[PDB]
Amino acid sequence: VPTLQSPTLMHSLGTLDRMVNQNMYEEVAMDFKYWDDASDAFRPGEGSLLPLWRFVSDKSKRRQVTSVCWNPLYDDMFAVGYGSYEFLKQASGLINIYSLKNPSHPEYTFHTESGVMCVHFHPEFANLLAVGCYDGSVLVYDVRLKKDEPIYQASVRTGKLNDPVWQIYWQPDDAQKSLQFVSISSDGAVNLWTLTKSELIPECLMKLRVAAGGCCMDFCKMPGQESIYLVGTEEGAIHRCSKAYSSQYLSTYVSHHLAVYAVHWNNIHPSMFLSASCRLDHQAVGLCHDPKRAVMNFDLNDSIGDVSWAALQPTVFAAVTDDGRVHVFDLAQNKLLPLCSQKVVKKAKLTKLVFNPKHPIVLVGDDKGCVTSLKLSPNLRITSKPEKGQKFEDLEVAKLDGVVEIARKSDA
Amino acid sequence: HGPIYGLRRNPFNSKYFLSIGDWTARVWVEDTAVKTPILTTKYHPTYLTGGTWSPSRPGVFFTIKMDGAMDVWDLYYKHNEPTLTVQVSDLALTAFAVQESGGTVAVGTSDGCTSVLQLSTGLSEASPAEKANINAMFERETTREKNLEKAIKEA
Amino acid sequence: LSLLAQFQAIMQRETLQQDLENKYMVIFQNYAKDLDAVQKLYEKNKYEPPVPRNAPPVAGNIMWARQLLRRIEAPMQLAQAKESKKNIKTYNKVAKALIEFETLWHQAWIKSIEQCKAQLVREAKYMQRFNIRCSSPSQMVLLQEEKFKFYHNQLTHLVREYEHVLGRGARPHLDDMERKIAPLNIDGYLHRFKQGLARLEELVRKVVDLTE
Amino acid sequence: DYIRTVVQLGSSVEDLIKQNNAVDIYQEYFTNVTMDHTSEAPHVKTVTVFK
Amino acid sequence: SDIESTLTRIQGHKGVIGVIIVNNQGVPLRSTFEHDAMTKQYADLVPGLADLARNLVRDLDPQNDLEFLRIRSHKHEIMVAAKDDFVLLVIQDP
Amino acid sequence: VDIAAVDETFKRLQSHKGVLGIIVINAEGIAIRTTFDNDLTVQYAALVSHFTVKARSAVRKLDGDNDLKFLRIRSKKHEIMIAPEFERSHEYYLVVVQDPSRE
Amino acid sequence: LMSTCMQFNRLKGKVLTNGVKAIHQDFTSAVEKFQQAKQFDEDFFGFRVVIKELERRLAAIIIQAFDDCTTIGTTFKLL
């Protein structure tokens, strides 16, 4: 009943602040949606990311972007998981949540007390955000409550991975009495978590045996089925199993010598994943059979932060290395050379690349606690348009398969 | 085992009876082929003495022990360890009762008094069939093990 | 070089097969160029080399050196006569420098295991799983880590649980536990402090339900 | 003069309409989400002890 | 401590020259200005425009209301968030 | 002929997403081109004429040398956009009605 | 081959009964594909692959159901 503390005052003030901040970046946003690079219908063989919004907060500069994730419904949310990767500069972690509606001030925020080495939003409900931490504590945060604190934790009583939790995921549990989580850790291996009464309980999935359980630092699951996923290691190899111990390492795609840093499936042609390591080469390899060779190889000058197939097309993909250059390949215009290699940051080593499902932009993330958002010039995004007698998934299977057979019989 | 102290049919859907009497807290069934438990639960410490079910929620139970507890054993969610261990007294509990609407319990202790508890919205339910189900399926495995001894000896 | 192998495999004419031996010198120019570039990385980054992620500082520098050596060495198996002499000399100085790291840093690690073994109690017993891969170990290898991250995980919990029950106070109670917190015998003290906090986790909730 | 004015205004407004379609400003996230996931651990209260 | 932090953020951007909150009839409470010879100008000129615009919108189909309003002059962007309790003003040249 | 140009501007504007309506009204509150029926037309013309002359008098009173080239009122349904061009021999506050919900 | 076939004719718990149903579904499907003179060694080692490959579903759905044994003697109901 004092008007100057009424909640609806704060509501309309927040909307008026967005209404202000829009009118401070009008060009950056109008280009985000209504602009096509007019000088790439003239030179067919290359492209040019155009840099857009930049997102910094003053608690971030002492921190390093250590994950990024996008929300299923709205397509203006991020989830930056600021944290640490150096062995000697170990800090407390952070997690903002940003928006495209205001880029300057984050909508939400939290403040953990170890390095947030992953995030993931839930796909169906659209708010609950699972995270992990440098010290095994997987956490779950609920967002619309506006209480700067978790709603569940882990302990050493329920379950604790005991070393960094590099990646976590959300499983769809269909209208059941639960929600599901799959994880991965340096010591020991994959664990399943549930969301019970007021707790999160481990169930162990498999152990990554080779000295000790071999370390591992990433995994991805195939969308189109669920059980079969791809797991990195630090012994070097890449493994693939299913949600069982059903032939521990169903596939053992072994080709590497160091810590692999990224794997990725590609949403079209469900047999073909690429991967990427810290041996300065990323390899785009086929999986139904084919476990002893790589269809291709793309060497480069500094080790890979990460890789990502495009959401909109299974030829183009992009990769991010430890120099300042994001470089992005079309696998069907050039053949072993990057279509567009551009340096975006000045004095930081980039470390995280994430695409966007609907609008065509990309997020890349620094070493200095910042995230910067690039746009893809039209030569990078070329989806073969469907027609009357054919389906869109089929043409994009066909392009990749043609490139695969060409370089398969041309390699040897 | 030994001097039995528990007996109660289950309510709210069916006829499966209980046996919380000695320091194992079973759940038994009434058929001429199943003369053996269905959901045997934990071998405990502190020799058991008495409890029942819920008449407003399917198949929880509530032991008491000679050092005293209301173990709110929810029994479709865990199956080994007491979901909620509360010690009302140090002295040994020797009774039990349930409010007819469910949500108030009573035990008088080893000397004297009588303590009346109150259990929150954990006591209500949304689906009463699958708990008849998992207390139906889980003893055809026992009749299945009755077949095996004939099969073993005939082999 | 893969292209040259394919062109060898395409066709047969004995003059051409006496001409596809020639182009290995044109190949050999660029390997020298790569042997130039890696050489620059060696001298520009001798003391403070960038590393892989979450890598410890002593023998997570060995891996960087090893990467440069094994980047330059694996094409040498395939590209094997005057220019070849100067290039094999330049390679054979880069080789000795890229063993100069991977022996002097290993020595510095020997004397640091003497230092730190008595936060950083990790690295002197966390390195020896990086070190166990290629090089040789030292005294009292990490046979003692099946306890020590039990010893830190239980013991940042129960001490942590001695804040929440002291968030429900508002005293001979706390007496009995400050006499237990303070004191190969870190087993029984964790016994004692777990049975210690079960007792007062009971007592404080009793007092709250009989006071509210 | 009327024609020139109308096309001038059409240009300006066309820019504005793009501005409103670019990103929607006036949209509160989670305007109405009812499903809440909460804390439901068992509570034991002794209302009175009958003695 | 959320209302005043949003005031302090919103008054420190690249073009903002003044934030005003005014009550139903008047009384501009919590201005932001180093003198008050032009706050009263805003407070007694602008909510006439806000409720006049609520008349214009609502007249058409009475399920409808007004929420915000912007007037962009040459050198100013007067944004008014009108509602039942009050009227709120933010002034900014882009 | 420029009549094709202005009608083309109507399809330029009207091809955008959600744009329900375009109308042009002069200083005497009488619509010239429409896109609506006739009575929603005349009530827009009267209402917006009076409202925009009040708003321009407000801005001119507030500061002597500043005028307005812009006006934007909001609904929960549709964001009416008014633009005016105050001049002599022509002052044609065109008004659009749109919303991004549709389609 | 028929010795393995007999031993595989001897086939929380809702999920795990569904799992050992999948193990039975596959072993039947595999042998019925084999229901159709020195290239039988190739299908023979394919079937060796399947047996020592679907013997790990068993070890997995018995590791996951050996903690949740309750007492001294639930383990022989599940062993």
From C209's Cα to the closest Cα of chain D, the distance in A is 6
Instruction: Select the residue of A22, A101, A127 nearest D33 (Cβ to Cβ).
Output: A127
Instruction: Determine the length of chain D.
Output: 51
In this structure, are strands E87-92 and F81-83 parallel, antiparallel, or unpaired?
unpaired
Q: Do G and F make contact, counting contact as 3+ CB pairs within 8 angstroms?
A: no
- Contact (CB, 8 A) for A128 and A143: yes
Size of interface A-D (CB pairs under 8 A): 51
Distance separating alpha carbons of residues A254 and A233, to the nearest angstrom: 10
F33 inside 8 A of chain E by CB: no
Residue of E nearest to A105 (CA): E9
Sheet hosting strand A191-195, strand order edge to edge: A169-171, A180-182, A191-195, A200-204
Contact A240, C45 (CB under 8 A): no
- Relative to beta strand A371-375, strand B8-9 is unpaired
- Rounded CA-CA distance A322/A100 in Å is 27
Instruction: Determine contact: B112 vs chain D, CB below 8 A.
Output: yes
Find chain F residues with C-beta within 8 A of D5's C-beta: 85, 87, 90, 92
Q: What is the resolution of this structure in A?
A: 7.5
What is the torsion angle, in degrees rounded to the nearest 10, for the CA atoms of residue D15, residue D16, residue D17 and residue D22? 90
In a 13 Å sphere around the CA of C49, the CA atoms on its Cβ side amount to 26
Interface contact A156, partner C, CB < 8 A: yes
Q: Position A380: which residue type?
A: L
Q: Write down the experimental method used for this entry.
A: cryo-EM
Against chain F, the chains showing at least 3 CB pairs within 8 Å are: D, E
Contact D45 C209 (CB under 8 A): yes
Interchain proximity G72–B42, CB inside 8 Å: no
In A4-149, alpha helices (H): 7-22, 27-34
Counting CB pairs under 8 A, whether chains E and C reach 3 or more, is no
Contact A342, A326 (CB under 8 A): yes
Interchain proximity F79–D2, CB inside 8 Å = no
AA identity, residue A27: E
Q: Which residues have a Cβ under 8 Å from the Cβ of C138 and sit 6 or more positions away?
A: C110, C113, C128
Phi, psi of E80 (to 5 degrees): -120, 125
C-alpha D37/C-alpha C23 separation (Å) is: 70
Sheet with strand D48-50: strands edge to edge = B106-108, B114-116, D48-50
Rounded to 5°, the CA angle A345-A348-A354 comes to 65
Residue A295: DSSP 8-state: S
B118 reaches D (C-beta below 8 A): yes
Can you say how many angstroms the Cα of residue B57 is from the centroid of all Cα atoms in its chain? 13
Q: How far apart are CA B41 and CA A277, in angstroms?
A: 50
Note whether B77 contacts G: Cβ–Cβ < 8 A.
Answer: no
Q: Is some CB atom of chain E closer than 8 A to the CB atom of A24? A: yes
Beta carbon pairs, A and C, within 8 Å: 40
Which of these, B59, A242, E64, A21, lies nearest to F79 by C-alpha position? E64
Q: Is A201 on the interface with D (CB under 8 A)?
A: no
Question: Is-contact C193 C199, C-beta < 8 A?
Answer: no
A38 touches chain E (CB under 8 A): no
Q: Find residues 87-106 of chain A whose CB sits inside 8 Å of chain C.
A: 87-88
Q: How far is CA A226 from the centre of its chain?
A: 18
Assigned token pair, E31:
């201005």
The total number of structural domains that make up chain F = 1
CA dihedral A351, A356, A362, A364 (to 10 degrees): -20
Helices E3-10 and A7-22: angle between axes, nearest 10 degrees? 20
Phi, psi of G18, rounded to the nearest 5 degrees: -65, -35
- Chain F residues with CB under 8 Å of a chain D CB are 2-3, 5-6, 9-10, 12-13, 16-19, 24, 69-70, 72, 74, 79, 81, 83, 85, 87, 89-90, 92, 94, 96, 98, 100
Taking the C-alpha atoms of residue E39 and residue E43, their distance in angstroms, rounded to an integer, is 6
In this complex, the residue of F47, F59, F68 whose CB is nearest that of residue E56 is: F47
Give D51 to chain C, closest Cα distance, Å: 15
With beta carbons less than 8 A apart as the criterion, state whether A330 and A319 touch: no
Cβ neighbour number for residue A163 with a 10 Å cutoff: 16
